[PDB]
RNA sequence: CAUGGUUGUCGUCAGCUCGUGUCGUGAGAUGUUGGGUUAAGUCCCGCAACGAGCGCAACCCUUGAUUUUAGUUGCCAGCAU
């Protein structure tokens, strides 16, 4: 399967090139098979306790894929910017959670109107801006028991903070990326639209098989 | 030039900070920079930061038009004197 140019590759993935071609490297699919075996097994073994599982899709080409798998799988996700402090500053992110909860309870259950225009002026624009980040994780009460990423080159903050928390992380890696930070890495290109979906399908099946 | 309290002053300038987080051996930084915009760290997009406080703004008084209430010590149109 494809990779990225020979101009900016990472030698940590010498294990994973296979039979290169015009400008772009290609990946050892059998290695990929074994890695997805370990990762699928481990995802199932993690979520067998009904844990909390977080997805990252900060990259354009996998926003939609991550979102679709996450809504099908009932486990939390992110696609817009990674708020620096998601899990380290989780206290204050959870303050923001409580705030959003208060707003959407105040609009319907408590009194909707207390000001003359402030509701549709500011409260709704703010609630848009909150959903523009918090997405799925609004109902993630505790920390994750495991994390999925799609591009540890783009998503280094999420990777780094999960590492500091010693949360187990997993994720696809293009040739530019670095697996040594990842625990149960999967070699594959992350810029194509079909493949990232094709992997998160299996990795959401892994949790759906056992959330029951 | 021991002090309180009161006061000018930079300057009604838009700035000064902080909890948690992160980077840095560390002091420190981040946030508070940037691109725009605004009278204004005002507000939006973006960002290893997310948020908050003091300030800014607004709530106050006054002036600027008008409705209802009340019409004397004010007013005088329609009226006589
Ligand atoms: Mg003021």
UniProtKB/Swiss-Prot annotation:
One cellular component term from this protein's GO annotations in UniProt: cytosolic small ribosomal subunit
Coiled coil: none
InterPro entries named in the record: Ribosomal_uS2, Ribosomal_uS2_bac/mit/plastid, Ribosomal_uS2_CS, Ribosomal_uS2_flav_dom_sf
Pfam families: Ribosomal_S2
Gene Ontology MF: a single term: structural constituent of ribosome
PROSITE patterns listed in its UniProt record: RIBOSOMAL_S2_1 (PS00962), RIBOSOMAL_S2_2 (PS00963)
Keywords, comma-separated and alphabetical: Ribonucleoprotein, Ribosomal protein
GO biological process, one term: translation
Assigned protein family: Belongs to the universal ribosomal protein uS2 family.
Protein name per UniProt: Small ribosomal subunit protein uS2
UniProt source species: Listeria monocytogenes serovar 1/2a (strain ATCC BAA-679 / EGD-e)
């Amino acid at each position: 399967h494809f990779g990225h140019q020979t101009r900016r590759w990472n030698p940590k993935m010498k294990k994973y090139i296979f039979t290169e071609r015009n400008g772009i490297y290609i990946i050892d699919l059998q290695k990929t098979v074994k890695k997805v075996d370990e990762a699928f097994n481990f995802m199932r073994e993690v979520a067998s306790d009904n844990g909390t599982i977080l997805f990252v899709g900060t990259k354009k080409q996998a926003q939609e894929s991550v979102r679709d798998e996450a809504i099908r799988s009932g486990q939390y996700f992110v696609n817009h910017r990674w708020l620096g402090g998601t899990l380290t500053n989780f206290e204050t992110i959870q303050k923001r959670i409580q705030h959003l909860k208060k707003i959407e309870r105040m609009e319907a259950d408590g009194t909707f109107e207390v000001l003359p225009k402030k509701e549709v002026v500011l409260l709704k624009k703010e609630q848009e801006k909150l959903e523009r980040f918090l997405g799925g994780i609004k109902d993630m009460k505790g920390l994750p028991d495991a994390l999925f990423i799609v591009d540890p080159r783009k998503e280094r903050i999420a990777v780094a903070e999960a590492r500091k928390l010693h949360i187990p992380i997993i994720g696809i890696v293009d040739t530019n990326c670095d697996p040594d930070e990842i625990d149960y890495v999967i070699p594959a290109n992350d810029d194509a639209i079909r493949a990232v979906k094709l992997l998160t399908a299996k990795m959401a099946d892994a949790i759906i098989e056992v959330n029951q």
